């Protein structure tokens, strides 16, 4: 807390030296729409995985499968922390997220030995849950990595079913303000390009765009 100054060496250009060395150029980056309100994997940095997003099953589908279950629509819990689970979703099986990339590599007999329930067939419907729908989304990506044709995700599984207020506790790794990053300590590039990459135009909380080239606008004046 208390507004720690950060140990990065970014700086705005002064009022004395000319603007030079335009084979790198920082400018302010402003996109069209806000993405911070959206789901975490519906944001801007995950757009390329947009076709990898699992189809959504909703609350009413989950209540209908609670009341009237199907033999091959497998409800699977993807929550990892055993200290944060307090209730049982009906007709659910426990396959925690951090083991999924190993779990689908097993045979059916090894799946039965290492989890106590049968391995789902690749044509069976699989429905995944988590606290917010984040561990279930990564698990759905791991389930779609293998050739599983029908994989669905209930976004906000436990927190809407049981009414809890929990989270999957995703870190989203951001450097500590004592950790000095790469381009300050290094002779990987020449001194002009090193000074021109480390400069920015404005405060260092917003996003910027780095230009690899620039030509002078001779047609203005």
């Amino acid at each position: 807390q208390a507004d720690r100054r950060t140990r990065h060496h970014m700086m705005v250009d002064g009022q004395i030296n000319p603007r030079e060395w335009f084979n790198w150029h920082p400018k302010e980056y402003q996109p069209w729409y806000f993405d911070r309100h959206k789901f975490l994997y519906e944001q801007r940095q995950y757009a390329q995985f947009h076709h990898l997003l699992c189809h959504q099953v909703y609350l009413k589908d989950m209540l209908h499968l609670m009341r009237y279950p199907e033999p091959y629509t497998h409800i699977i819990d993807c929550r990892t922390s055993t200290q944060k689970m307090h209730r049982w979703v009906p007709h659910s099986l426990w396959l925690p997220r951090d083991e999924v990339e190993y779990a689908l590599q097993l045979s059916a007999d090894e799946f039965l030995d290492m989890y106590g329930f049968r391995k789902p067939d690749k044509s069976d419907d699989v429905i995944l849950l988590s606290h917010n729908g984040i561990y279930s989304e990564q698990a759905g990506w791991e389930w779609k990595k293998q050739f599983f044709q029908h994989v669905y995700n209930y976004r906000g599984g436990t927190n809407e079913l049981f009414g809890e207020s929990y989270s999957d506790m995703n870190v989203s790794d951001v450097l500590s303000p004592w950790k000095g990053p790469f381009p300050q300590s290094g002779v990987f590039v020449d001194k002009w390009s090193k000074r021109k990459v480390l400069t920015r135009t404005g405060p260092f909380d917003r996003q910027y765009e780095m230009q690899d080239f620039a030509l002078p606008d001779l047609e203005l004046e």
Binding site: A108, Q146, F147
Partner: protein
């Protein structure tokens, strides 16, 4: 209660998938000066590299665009 022990007659085979680097293609098409060099001396303030092929007479080209670069007999 459980009465019978039954197995399913349809046998499934796990599709073995794996990503290997089987093709080796590369687009080698550049726009650059390429030199016949009898000697090259790269002097930047950290590392100096002296590569010499012998001759009776040499020439000298010198480039100071990024770091000191001395070329003998172009």
């Amino acid at each position: 209660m459980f009465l019978i022990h039954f197995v399913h007659y349809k046998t499934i085979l796990q599709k073995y998938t794996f990503k290997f680097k089987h093709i080796f293609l590369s687009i080698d098409k550049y726009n650059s000066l390429f030199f016949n060099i009898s000697g090259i001396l790269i002097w930047l303030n950290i590392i100096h590299i002296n590569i010499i092929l012998i001759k009776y007479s040499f020439f000298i080209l010198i480039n100071n665009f990024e770091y000191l670069i001395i070329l003998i007999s172009t």
